[PDB]
Design a protein around this ligand. Sequence first.
Ligand SMILES: Nc1nc2c(ncn2[C@@H]2O[C@H](COP(=O)(O)OP(=O)(O)NP(=O)(O)O)[C@@H](O)[C@H]2O)c(=O)[nH]1
Ligand SMILES: NC[C@H]1O[C@H](O[C@H]2[C@H](O[C@@H]3O[C@H](CO)[C@@H](O)[C@H]3O)[C@@H](O)[C@H](N)C[C@@H]2N)[C@H](N)[C@@H](O)[C@@H]1O
Ligand SMILES: [Cl-]
Ligand SMILES: [Mg+2]
Ligand SMILES: [Mg+2]
Length: 296
Amino acid sequence: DDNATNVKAMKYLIEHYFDNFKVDSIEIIGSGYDSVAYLVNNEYIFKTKFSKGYAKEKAIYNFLNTNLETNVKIPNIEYSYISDELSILGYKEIKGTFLTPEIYSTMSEEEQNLLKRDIASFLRQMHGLDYTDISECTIDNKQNVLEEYILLRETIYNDLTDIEKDYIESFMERLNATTVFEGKKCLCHNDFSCNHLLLDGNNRLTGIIDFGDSGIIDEYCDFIYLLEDSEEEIGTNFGEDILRMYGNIDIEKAKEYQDIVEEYYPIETIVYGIKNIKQEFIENGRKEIYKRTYKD
Ligand SMILES: Nc1nc2c(ncn2[C@@H]2O[C@H](COP(=O)(O)OP(=O)(O)NP(=O)(O)O)[C@@H](O)[C@H]2O)c(=O)[nH]1
Ligand SMILES: NC[C@H]1O[C@H](O[C@H]2[C@H](O[C@@H]3O[C@H](CO)[C@@H](O)[C@H]3O)[C@@H](O)[C@H](N)C[C@@H]2N)[C@H](N)[C@@H](O)[C@@H]1O
Ligand SMILES: [Cl-]
Ligand SMILES: [Mg+2]
Ligand SMILES: [Mg+2]
């Protein structure tokens, strides 16, 4: 019994904290580096974490369920337990199939267009919300990076190689010269990748999950994965078309914003390692810097 034990513990905690909730079945459906999500009674999702723990995400679902006008479904929190050492959010599973590159490639041109229009429409509607009632949830990525650079300088920066230092400094120089943080701010999903997008039986967008990183931030943020060229995402043209449908936005700046975030990735990974005292992340990030430096 490996997998069997985690599930038992979480079944115990769910029943203990949610007085009249009976767990008849429970399985792991996903996990991050510091969280685990479970499917319970083939009906409920329970996102859990042993903290930095789930209060903001819940506030955002509550704000969005009150204010969004859309047929696209999002989580609606029925159960929550939030404490310093433990957080749990429960909601009814949104039913559907996650969008993937393989699926997209089987769709007709028209089906692809309609999906793109759906996404644009959802983003336009969310970005247009008056965010006053969630004003607390502001995120300044540039300032966050500066603070993370300071933490590097205070911890391991001096032990890095010249090549690692150069990569970091060359990123900081670019950050200082860019104008992409100076545009429209709005409420963004802020992790808007196709593993969070659900399709219904006609390949239309039916739901969106994981607003855990959402906040008032640069409008460009919600396009960075839609613009990404990788195995996990659909491709740059997909993001471009969505941008054109969404309208009133500088595409070249959206791409610059995406490229800068991408350049930061290995540094983000290093910083996560430092803050969470996980050496393997520090090592992975540094190695990634070498791989990027040597790519022709
Ligand atoms: N079909 C379906 N799957 C969901 C739903 N909610 C969660 N999941 C599944 O559970 C996984 C984990 O959920 P998610 O919100 O993305 O959280 P996380 O990124 O792992 N954790 P965190 O946001 O704390 O870093 C998703 O990849 C998906 O497999 C839902 O409503 N419907
Ligand atoms: N799983 C490996 C992939 O990681 C990154 O992309 C994923 C992404 O990871 C972030 O990407 C940023 C750098 O672009 C960072 O902030 C990451 O945290 C994740 O947050 C999204 N929900 C899904 C994205 N596909 C990379 N962009 C991509 O090139 C790479 O293939
Ligand atoms: Cl290391
Ligand atoms: Mg997720
Ligand atoms: Mg998340």
